């Protein structure tokens, strides 16, 4: 599985929108509570993402997510492509969010606690998702 | 220079607050426009940061930034320590922001364009800051 491929989707919890990106080769996740499920929020998220990792291509389970001109501007500027092709982490992440929920007042706080727990967790014997991404990407530099 | 050390500060531009984190060993940056320069915003930013990189210790040029209980809760939960010890990227980042400013309506957009440009830029002959962090961190896993 290519190191430049990410999957991005939105889920819903407590009336709010959680934008979830998955680095597919590693299982590493970034997520953000966004105020509305719009092109503008997706575009802005993609710019942030791309400044941090070598994002080559992005898949989603809702292709209409990427039709806004604002999103196409962000993938043009950052050099990203979309892919259909001519886990789901959503359940897992929600499970983690439910386990930490009482530890926080705001959903957005519980989401970041859950991302932290997921990325640091030993899938071992065996690295964490956060170790794997960095090693997948370092190796692909070298 | 240790791979777990980050520097965090806020600067001001156009009446707004930009929270800037620097991975000191590599020069890699993450930044976010925040609505107010408060403990709550710093705490939330630190949680996001820590879920993505192995953050061990954080330095700042304004130690009072880390006195709120909300911030101390976030460094306790994530396992972070603060350090006084018993570039500035701020000018550089602002230079980049000024170079891309007209390419965007919102300051927050220009900030992420600038972070992208800074992290991807060849400091070579020579890696980018984004290559260096990942390789510094991968090597420190291994
Ligand atoms: C007296 C007092 C002072 C502060 C807080 C307080 N308030 C808020 C809104 C938050 C979290 O929100 C932020 C935005 C600060 C992360 C949260 O959502 O619970 C947190 C918090 C929760 C988890 C972590 Cl890992 C870090 C900070 C705390 C501790 C609570 C009390 C009772
Ligand atoms: C007809 C039409 C449609 C959309 C936009 C439009 N509007 C906004 C508010 C934004 C940027 O904001 C977001 C939040 C979407 C990134 C910006 O700040 O300029 C962008 C934008 C700017 C730079 C990039 Cl790299 C990506 C998107 C665009 C293209 C402009 C026009 C004239």
CA–CA dist A119, A93 (Å, integer): 11
- Ligand 2 binding site (Cβ under 6 Å of any ligand atom): A 40, 43-44, 47, 69-70, 73-74, 77; B 103-106, 109, 113
Was A61 annotated as part of a binding site? yes
Phi, psi angles (nearest 5°) of residue B7: -115, 135
Taking one residue from A and the other from B, the number of pairs with CB-CB distance under 8 angstroms is 75
Cis peptide before B75 (omega within 30 of 0): no
Resolution in A: 2.0
Name the residue among A70, A66, A111, A73 with its Cα closest to residue A93: A111
Structure tokens at A24: 């597919």
Provide DSSP, A74-140. Answer: HHHHHT-EE------HHHHHHHHHHHHGGG-SSHHHHHHHHHHHHHHS-------HHHHHHHHHHHH
Nearest CB partner across the interface for B135, out of A44, A78, A138: A138
Q: Report which ligand 2 atom has the smallest distance to the Cα of A78.
A: 25
Q: Does the CB atom of residue A11 touch ligand 1 within 6 A?
A: no
CA–CA dist B93, B10 (Å, integer): 12
The two beta strands, B81-82 and A57-59, are unpaired
Q: Exposed, middle or buried by CB within 10 Å (0-12, 13-18, 19+), for B37?
A: middle
Sheet holding A16-23, edge to edge: A28-34, A16-23, A5-13, A57-59, A81-82
In this structure, are residues A55 and A44 in contact, taking their beta carbons and an 8 Å threshold?
no
Q: Say if the Cβ atoms of B130 and A54 lie within 8 Å.
A: yes
Whose structure tokens read 């590493």?
A28
Q: Which residues are paired to B31 by β-bridges?
A: B20
Spell out the domains of chain B, with CATH numbers in brackets. 1-142 (3.30.420.10)
- Please state how this structure was obtained: X-ray
Decide: helix, strand or coil at residue B84.
Answer: coil
How remote is the C-alpha of A138 from its chain's centroid? 19
H or E, element range at A41: helix A39-52
In this structure, are residues A90 and A11 in contact, taking their beta carbons and an 8 Å threshold?
yes
In this structure, are residues B55 and B4 in contact, taking their beta carbons and an 8 Å threshold?
yes
Provide DSSP, B47-68. Answer: HHHHHHS---EEE-S-GGGG-S
Show me where chain B is broken: residue before each gap, C-N > 2.5 A: 86, 125
């Amino acid at each position: 599985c290519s190191p430049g491929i990410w999957q991005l989707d939105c889920t819903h919890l407590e009336g709010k929108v959680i934008l979830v990106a998955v680095h597919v080769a590693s299982g590493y996740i970034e997520a953000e509570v966004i105020p509305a499920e719009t092109g503008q929020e997706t575009a802005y998220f993609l710019l942030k993402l791309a400044g941090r990792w070598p994002v080559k291509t992005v898949h989603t389970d809702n292709g209409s997510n990427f039709t806004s001109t604002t999103v196409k501007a962000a993938c043009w500027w950052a050099g990203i492509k979309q892919e259909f092709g001519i886990e789901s982490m959503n359940k897992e992440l929600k499970k983690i969010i439910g386990q930490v929920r009482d530890q926080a007042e705001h959903l957005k706080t519980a989401v970041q606690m859950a991302v932290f727990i997921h990325n640091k967790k030993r899938k071992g014997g065996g690295y964490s998702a956060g170790e794997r991404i960095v090693d997948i990407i370092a190796t692909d530099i070298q």
